[PDB]
Amino acid sequence: LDIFSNYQKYIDNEQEVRENIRIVVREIEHLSKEAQIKLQIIHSDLSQISAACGLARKQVELCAQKYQKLAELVPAGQYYRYSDHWTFITQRLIFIIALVIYLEAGFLVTRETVAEMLGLKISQSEGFHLDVEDYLLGILQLASELSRFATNSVTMGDYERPLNISHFIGDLNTGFRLLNLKNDGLRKRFDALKYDVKKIEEVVYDVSIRGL
Amino acid sequence: LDIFSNYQKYIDNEQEVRENIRIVVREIEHLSKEAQIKLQIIHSDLSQISAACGLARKQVELCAQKYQKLAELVPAGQYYRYSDHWTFITQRLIFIIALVIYLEAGFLVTRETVAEMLGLKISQSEGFHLDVEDYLLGILQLASELSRFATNSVTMGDYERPLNISHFIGDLNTGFRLLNLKNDGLRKRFDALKYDVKKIEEVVYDVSIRGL
Amino acid sequence: LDIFSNYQKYIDNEQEVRENIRIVVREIEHLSKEAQIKLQIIHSDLSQISAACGLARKQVELCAQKYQKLAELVPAGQYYRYSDHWTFITQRLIFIIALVIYLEAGFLVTRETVAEMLGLKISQSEGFHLDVEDYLLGILQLASELSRFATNSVTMGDYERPLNISHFIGDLNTGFRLLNLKNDGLRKRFDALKYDVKKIEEVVYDVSIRGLSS
Amino acid sequence: DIFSNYQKYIDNEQEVRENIRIVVREIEHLSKEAQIKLQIIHSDLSQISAACGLARKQVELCAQKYQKLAELVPAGQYYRYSDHWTFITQRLIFIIALVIYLEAGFLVTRETVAEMLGLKISQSEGFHLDVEDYLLGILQLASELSRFATNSVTMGDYERPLNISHFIGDLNTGFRLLNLKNDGLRKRFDALKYDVKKIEEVVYDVSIRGLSS
Amino acid sequence: LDIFSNYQKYIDNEQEVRENIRIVVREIEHLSKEAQIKLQIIHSDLSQISAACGLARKQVELCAQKYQKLAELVPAGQYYRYSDHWTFITQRLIFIIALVIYLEAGFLVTRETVAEMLGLKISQSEGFHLDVEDYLLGILQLASELSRFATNSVTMGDYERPLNISHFIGDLNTGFRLLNLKNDGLRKRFDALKYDVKKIEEVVYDVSIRGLSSK
Amino acid sequence: LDIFSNYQKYIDNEQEVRENIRIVVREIEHLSKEAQIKLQIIHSDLSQISAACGLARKQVELCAQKYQKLAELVPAGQYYRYSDHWTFITQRLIFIIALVIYLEAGFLVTRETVAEMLGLKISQSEGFHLDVEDYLLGILQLASELSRFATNSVTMGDYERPLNISHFIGDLNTGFRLLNLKNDGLRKRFDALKYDVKKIEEVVYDVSIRGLSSKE
Amino acid sequence: VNLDIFSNYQKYIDNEQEVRENIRIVVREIEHLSKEAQIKLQIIHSDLSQISAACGLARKQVELCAQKYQKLAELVPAGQYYRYSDHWTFITQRLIFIIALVIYLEAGFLVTRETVAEMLGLKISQSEGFHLDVEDYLLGILQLASELSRFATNSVTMGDYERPLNISHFIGDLNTGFRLLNLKNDGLRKRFDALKYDVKKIEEVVYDVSIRGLSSK
Amino acid sequence: LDIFSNYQKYIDNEQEVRENIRIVVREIEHLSKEAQIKLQIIHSDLSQISAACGLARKQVELCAQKYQKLAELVPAGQYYRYSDHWTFITQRLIFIIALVIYLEAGFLVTRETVAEMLGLKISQSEGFHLDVEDYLLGILQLASELSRFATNSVTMGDYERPLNISHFIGDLNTGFRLLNLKNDGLRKRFDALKYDVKKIEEVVYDVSIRGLSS
């Protein structure tokens, strides 16, 4: 029965560390929102793109900071014990950088760069790292955004934007079958990529079928 | 044993006030129907819009009255004890005003104005107020209506109506991520907003891709 | 869009008050546990009853205090806006008093006395009151406890305990039909009272069918 | 190429999984054996010590396969693959807690469980026994010991129930002495009162017919 | 589209008659409660039986009246169109009479007598009748009550009460297999009769196993 | 105990009449299927419509017959005692006529005509009648069919079919709000009418949104 | 681009889809017969006297099923057993349970697989012809648990206080032979696992009897 | 009780053969992926077609081998007892050849040729054969691919590709009504063919309405 008092001394600690961690993550959900809202502008005002990439980078330079405090909360080797506390809001952010990197310089941001921009490592040995599964589920979110971008881009006159997209999403669908995912929780999300490529193909059809 | 007779004296009262309250609410459901049916006309006859906004305002000027009687039934400080009796049929009506405000003057009706048109306060201190969570869930119903409007509007020739919508729904999706809802009963209903914006984007595509 | 910034200024407040309120309630769940665990002793050691009623009262004298702080967190007229935060852990506690009142003095604690022991009122006009629906759902929990008590009491030799119970639960089933509940969330919990009375009848059978007395 | 590097790592996590299910499958197999043999106690009270024995021959084996499981899991990745065995460990923690009760009439310590399976008691020291898993294990003792109390009276032993309702009695005690917050385990503690229910009922049935051996 | 206005003129009438009918039935639910609460006394005070049969008969004499008003609401030949509005609260009452008839005179109340005490007919030709399926489902409720009675009766000293019950419930289980119900909504309720006879047998066991019938 | 023997003499009768009635209804489910399967053709071969309306009418002329035998099984004034035995497979058939009436002559079949084609009355006084609630729940089934018809019609080239539909389903949605159903078992089925009108609107969109090009 | 290739296709595709409706037709007659036996055997839960009477009717049912079964064999082309197997793997479990019940009611032991085929006019190997799928046989006499737990319960209702004890040795040896297995997790592994909950109340019922129960001067 | 030990001796064998069969099939799912991914290139680079048909044929020449091993695992006359283990991943492959046969030589691959390229027979008498129902459900997968091809083809300039497709898919829709499928599991999949022909017609419209050909 003292056995159960020792239990409370440990159980208070794990449950205190959780509310402390949700607290940091809540600040990161808050920062993420800001970037995503601002980047929404790109579906109606193509001129504000670079303007908006900018704000979003002001957001990311901040996120890194709160992330580093998240590391001071997690005890070493316990990464995956509390992982589910941020695996989401990191995908939410990996998608945000991958978009901004495509908008700016028209290629696909490396995993390594993402960690560079958020103050992580690229192996859990070196410290608080970027879960490689999280990274992927992030830049998979690029499909749903870039199919809406292709549609909204033709709305605003830019008739080249679709073709350039279907080569990016084209090489992106390429690298996901070049995989060989086995049926897990992520296999499901890759399978819904074909429907995004679907309307991106359709949109490239619509342009060069009217010579627009 | 008398303890249980006193119980009946109070238990008759709460259950009498309930049937009295359903009675008022039923009259308000009835009035709401009328407005919603008449505003349905906008999906087939663009000329009857102002005509239909009109009938609906005749409906609202009435609802306020029944609403004030609902206040004479509810004992002070018991607002949320019977709240569930009308939280629905108020969202049903908040949507009706927000639609009529958009149709007429092309902007988004304030929460304060909604109470002004129904004879409520804007704080439960001042009296029978408009639950701020109810207001929100009301003007979220605007998405499902205005996506159908955008579709039915092009059916009837008006090719500008979509573009104007996707800026309204555009600034509306903006203010909902500018939030940071935590996963409750309303978080679910905001998430199904992206699918409405989906076909509103698609429709703005359809117009300026054939130029009409 | 400023409209949505004002929104955050209010929305932070309602959601701050919630975590502040769960915090108080959590302290009350903690105190409640203590009382309920200690009163579990009555199912194996009939000698520790008064001893255990005592500990539980030390628990209640404390609960009242945290309850009064809960009142300083709730803004007037908003009782039922956050009611669901404690309607449970009050039934949990109304049952605890009704049990301790039955164990000690063999009758049924008044609603008014329950509020007197927790520093509440008996009307939401006067202030932070004891929700009369909560009170009932509490002393309905007495059935499941006192059926187990009647069973465990015969285990330990006391052959009068069942008969005395079936007159308490007897007059208690009486007052609940003397009602006329209409089918809500509480109508369901009254209906599962007949199954408690069931084994309490059965236990009174078992004793005076073997002329068992002590 | 970014997506080819991806395959080189993605093959590894998915190879380690099938390698880990493989070890676990061997541990499910061993577990069954012990549980089946301990089923005997519901019909032949004489085979108890006999059956505790076979079960211990099973446990001495499980530890071994467990230590190989540790050579498969990379350090600090404990909880990345935890869900692969959190079940089949509760399955086994229940198996020892039963055998410890059958033999020596008290409740096996968490520390001893690890001692019998070659684990640590902290994830710092290495592959440890997840303290949440341990609990969910010795909660499985209620469903077994209520059936034991019932089947025990069937076979004549009229003291067995009373001794159970003090074990399950002190066990229900330590679970309210907790203060679980509503998670996945809170749900399983709540269904403990229905097990104590029929264990009380059975202690009633014996000493209400004055039954004593 | 006038076609749909005519529709409203009829649809208001059926839905008005329903609220009018629930209104009568609600009064009958109210009266039924009274009887059933008062007859509950027999489980703790064997002396108040005849006293309680009495109050219950005061309730039935009343129910008949409201019933006859229910007949003035139901248009002829529409009996089964609104049947589901009272098939319950009639079983609730058929059980109440069958109990009072058993308590008083120790036999089983005829279907014909039940209608006589409620002002109905015994064929839907003659008018508002007592649905024979409803009657049965009523005096099937006798099992759950008289098994609790047998149990509570021994509690209070009356050691003959069980034996007398197991011959009533005995002849009752007899007439239900003498049937040949085909699997419907009522077949299910007859099957749960065996569990009532179960403890009624058990209770007759418990008495004459400690020698409590005078002999 | 004889009281319970008399009971069996009656209880055999109600339960015999039930199997006799399910027997008639089973023959009517069978005939119904035939009509509905043949009318499915309209979703792929617009030329077989009149051909298929025909087969379906050969089915209905038959159903009436079995229906009249169902009347000889039901004792007068017991209509609603066994109603639940066919309230379904009549909605199944009321939808079948309403579809064939729309396909042929482009308007909405009267309740009175439905009874005329099945040998019923229009009041339970006159005899075995067509339950007016059943009639409604039938021609509500028209929505799910005619939305799929509008979609499959554009597939096959007929670009006028949708517009004509959205005026039929348009006036049909009109008469259902012109109601004032109170929340029962049928209120639920009317509410799921808006989702059928939804895609029918969408389809009319898709047609008249595909006009011309530049001309240079 | 040839198009006759797709006409030949119709000539074969009409045949497999005709044989299916022909096969459902036979199976429908067998579902019909099965019902009869199961309904009549339901009587045992309320009238212990009608057992032998009811075993009888059910055997009149099985003597008939065999016949329709042999016609089902004339519809299935050799070596295509498992191509249409899913058309009857259910309604055979339905019947394997019916025999295993009647064999237990009658002579108190467990019917052999070989005997089941003997009573239905099958073989015991798909070489010899239309056989009794061994997986089907098992899934049948697993249905015995749900029936015999309800029987033990309904038996004590009607006075027979030995019936439970006799059941818990049959179900006892039956639970024995199922762990003596080593099923790997498939579609049948799931159905064996729900056997412990049937043994549960059968143990409970043997408890209830020999716990009642008295020790007087 | 020994009756149930003999049972285990057979039951281990059927469940060992299953894991052995899933093992071969898994290797064939792996090879199939390779062909399908590589043939995806045709939707963006019309020059790599013949290049990609080639890689895919290097994949098929391999598949046949693993297939022949699958035959050494299946006991004769038990074809359909384990059929459900590969009926999918063969449609997956029948589609892969039918596509590569269309891309190369512009006609429709015979069922007989499919077996020739995979080392099967064309009757279950002769041995491990190609289930004719599987073959069909394969070359039905041609519609979804060739509608996307017609769309992506005009994207890349080739304005004749649609017209040629609508005669292939045209003669293919022809042979499927020339059928008379009865409502089973495959009747459903043929019915969703009209929606593929739909956009294929639409695309032929789009080209010769801006006279991109003729």
Distance, CA of H94 to CA of H142 (rounded, Å): 10
- Comparing CA positions, the residue from E55, E56, E135 lying closest to residue E95 is E135
C-beta of residue D213 within 8 angstroms of C-beta of residue D155: no
Residue F97 corresponds to which tokens in the numbers above? 């006529």
Name the strand (E) or helix (H) holding F44.
none
3-state secondary structure chain E: CCHHHHHHHHHHHHHHHHHHHHHHHHHHHHHHHHHHHHHHHHHCCHHHHHHHHHHHHHHHHHHHHHHHHHHHHCCCCCHHHCHHHCHHHHHHHHHHHHHHHHHHHCCCCCHHHHHHCCCCECCCCCCCECCHHHHHHHCCCHHHHHHHHHHHHHHCCCCCHHHHHHHHHHHHHHHHHCCCCCCCCCHHHHHHHHHHHHHHHHHHHHHHCCCCCCC
For residue H106, give both structure tokens.
Answer: 């512009």
Cβ contact B80–C80 (<8 Å): yes
Write the CB contacts of E205 (distance below 8 Å, at least 6 apart in sequence): none
| Six-digit token string for D69 | 């499981």
Distance CA F72, CA A5 (A): 80
Residues ≥6 apart with Cβ < 8 Å to C35 = C55, C56, C59, C60, C93, C96
- Asked if C159 and C214 count as a contact pair (C-beta separation under 8 A), the reply is yes
The CB density around residue B178, as the number of other CB atoms within 10 Å, is: 16
Distance of CA A209 to CAs A158, F213, H160, Å?
15, 11, 13
Asked if C176 is an interface residue toward chain B (Cβ–Cβ < 8 A), one would say yes
| Size of chain E, expressed as the number of residues it contains | 215
- Nominal resolution (angstroms): 4.2
CA distance G23 to G72: 7
Q: Give the angle F113-F117-F119 at the CA atoms, nearest 5°.
A: 110
Residues 6+ apart with CB under 8 A from A105: none
Structure tokens at C133: 């629906």
SS3 E185: coil
DSSP code, position B193 = T
Full 3-state SS string of chain G: CCCCHHHHHHHHHHHHHHHHHHHHHHHHHHHHHHHHHHHHHHHHHCCHHHHHHHHHHHHHHHHHHHHHHHHHHHHCCCCCHHHCHHHCHHHHHHHHHHHHHHHHHHHCCCCCHHHHHHCCCCECCCCCCCECCHHHHHHHCCCHHHHHHHHHHHHHHCCCCCHHHHHHHHHHHHHHHHHCCCCCCCCCHHHHHHHHHHHHHHHHHHHHHHCCCCCCC
Chain E positions touching G214 (Cβ under 8 A) are: 209
Compute CA distances D112 → D55, D96, H79, whole Å: 16, 10, 53
CB contact under 8 A, F155 and H195: yes
Option in B5, B81, B111 nearest C178 (CB): B5
One-character DSSP codes across H96-130:
HHHHHHHHHHSS---HHHHHHTTT-BSSTTTSSB-
Round to whole Å and give the CA distance between H165 and H148.
Answer: 11
- The phi-psi region of residue H16 (left if phi > 0; otherwise alpha if psi is between -120 and 50; otherwise beta) is alpha
For residue D121, give how far its alpha carbon lies from the nearest alpha carbon of chain G (Å): 32
Residue tagged 């809540």 (tokens): A26
The tokens describing C64, both together, are 């009242």
Q: Coil, helix or strand for F116? A: helix
3-class state of residue C21 by DSSP = helix
End-to-end Cα distance, chain A: 79
Q: How far apart are CA H155 and CA H153, in angstroms?
A: 5
The β-bridge partners of H121 are H129
Which residues lie across from D128 on neighbouring strands?
Answer: D120
Cβ neighbours of C159 (radius 10 Å): 17
CA–CA gap between residue E132 and residue E130 (Å, rounded): 6
- What angle, 0 to 180 degrees and rounded to 10, lies between the N-to-C axes of helices A3-39 and A87-105? 20
Residues E49, E51, E53: CA angle, nearest 5 degrees: 70
User: How far apart are alpha carbons H106 and H149 in whole angstroms?
Assistant: 14
CA atoms of E80 and E74, how far apart (whole Å): 10
**Which chain B residues are within 8 Å of F180, Cβ to Cβ?**
33
Q: Which residues contact F104 (CB under 8 A, 6 or more apart)?
A: F50, F53
Is the distance from CB of A141 to CB of A91 less than 8 angstroms? yes
F118 within 8 A of F63, measured Cβ to Cβ: yes
Q: Could you tell me if F95 and F143 are in contact, meaning their C-beta atoms sit under 8 angstroms apart?
A: no
Close Cβ partners of D187 (under 8 Å, ≥ 6 residues apart): none
Nearest to F175 among E4, E10, E184 (CB): E4
Torsion of CA H170, H171, H175, H177, to 10 degrees: 30
Q: Is C148 in the D-facing interface, judged by CB distances under 8 Å?
A: yes
Retrieve residue F82's tokens.
Answer: 């066994």
Task: Report the DSSP beta bridge partners of residue G123.
Answer: G131
Token pair, residue H167, equals: 């005669």
Six-digit token string for F37: 């399967």
Residue type, position E185, single letter: G
C74 touches chain D (CB under 8 A): no
Cα B180 to Cα C3: distance, rounded to the nearest angstrom: 15
In the three-class reduction of DSSP (H, G, I as helix; E, B as strand; rest coil), residue B86 is classed as coil
- Stated length of chain C: 214
The dihedrals phi and psi of B180, each to the nearest 5 degrees, come to 140, 55
Burial of D1 (0-12, 13-18, 19+ CB in 10 A): exposed
Which residues are registered as beta bridge partners of A121?
Answer: A129
Residues A150 and A200 sit within 8 Å (Cβ to Cβ):
yes
H210 vs F contacts (CB less than 8 Å):
213
Stated as kind and residue range, the H or E segment containing C77 is none
Distance CA A140, CA A121 (A): 21
Among A181, A149, A184, smallest CA distance to A165 is for A149
The sign of the torsion formed by the CA atoms of D98, D104, D107, D111 equals: negative
Chains F and C touch (3+ CB pairs under 8 A): no
**For E17, phi and psi rounded to 5 degrees?**
-60, -35
Q: Which residue bears the tokens 């056995």?
A: A3
Tell me the chain G residues in contact with residue E177 when contact means C-beta distances shorter than 8 Å: 46-47
Domains of chain B are 3-207 (1.20.58.190)
CA distance D180 to D142: 18
Output the 3-class SS for A151-192: HHHHHCCCCCHHHHHHHHHHHHHHHHHCCCCCCCCCHHHHHC
Distance CA D154, CA G203 (A): 9
Q: Do B43 and F201 touch (CB under 8 A)?
A: yes
The label of the residue with tokens 């984007």 reads: B201
Question: What are φ and ψ of residue C129, in 5° steps?
Answer: -110, 170
Enter the tokens of residue F56.
Answer: 């379906």
Distance CA D192, CA D143 (A): 8
Please say whether the beta carbons of A46 and A53 come within 8 A: no
Interchain CB contact of A83 with D (< 8 Å): yes
CA dihedral E90, E93, E95, E100 (to 10 degrees): -150
Comparing C-alpha atoms, which of D168, D198, D176 is closest to residue D101?
A: D168
**Chain CA centroid to CA D178, Å:** 19
- Cβ–Cβ contacts within 10 Å for residue E123, how many? 11
Alpha helices, DSSP H only, in chain A? 3-39, 49-73, 87-105, 111-116, 132-138, 142-155, 161-177, 187-191, 194-208
**Phi, psi angles (nearest 5°) of residue D155:** -105, 10
C-beta neighbour count of H88 within 10 angstroms: 13
Assess contact for A99 and A142: CB atoms under 8 A.
Answer: yes
Whether a cis peptide bond, with omega within 30° of 0, leads into H54 is no
Strand partners, C121: C129
Q: How far is CA D181 from CA A21, A80, C29, D130, in A?
A: 17, 21, 10, 18
Chain centroid to CA A100: 11
| Distance from C-alpha of H95 to C-alpha of H91, rounded to nearest angstrom | 6
Three-class SS of residue F37?
helix
Contact between D103 and D53 (Cβ < 8 Å): no
CA distance B135 to B95: 8
Angle at E187 between CA E181 and CA E188, to 5 degrees: 165
Q: How many CA atoms lie within 13 A of D109 on its CB side?
A: 7
Question: Quick one: CA dihedral E175, E179, E182, E184, positive or negative?
Answer: negative
Quick one: CA torsion of F94, F96, F97, F103, rounded to 10 degrees?
A: 140
Q: Shortest Cα distance from G11 to chain E (angstroms)?
A: 46
Residues F88, F90: Cα–Cα separation, whole Å: 5
Gap between the Cα atoms of C83 and C129, Å rounded: 11
Q: Is E19 exposed, middle or buried (CB count within 10 Å of its CB: 0-12, 13-18, 19+)?
A: exposed
Q: What are phi and psi of E107, to 5 degrees?
A: -120, -170
Which residue in C98, C79, C105 sits closest to C143, CA to CA? C98
Q: Is A75 helix (H, G, I), strand (E, B) or coil?
A: coil
3-class secondary structure, B129: strand
CB contact under 8 A, G207 and D154: yes
**Torsional sign, CA G198, G201, G205, G207:** positive
Cα separation values, E111 from D68, E115, E116, Å: 78, 7, 9
Nearest to G67 by CA among G26, G23, G31: G26
Q: Which residue does chain B place closest to F211, by CA atoms?
A: B210
- Whole-angstrom Cα distance, residue C131 to residue C89? 12
- Of A4, A133, A136, nearest to D174 by CB-CB distance is A4
Residues at the binding site of G for Mg(2+) are 147
d(CA D28, CA D31): 5
SS3 B143: helix
Name, in order, each residue with C-beta under 8 angstroms of B130's C-beta and a sequence gap of 6 or more: B90, B94, B111, B114, B115, B118, B120, B121, B122
Contact between A188 and A137 (Cβ < 8 Å): no
Give CA angle at F168 (F166, F172), nearest 5°: 110
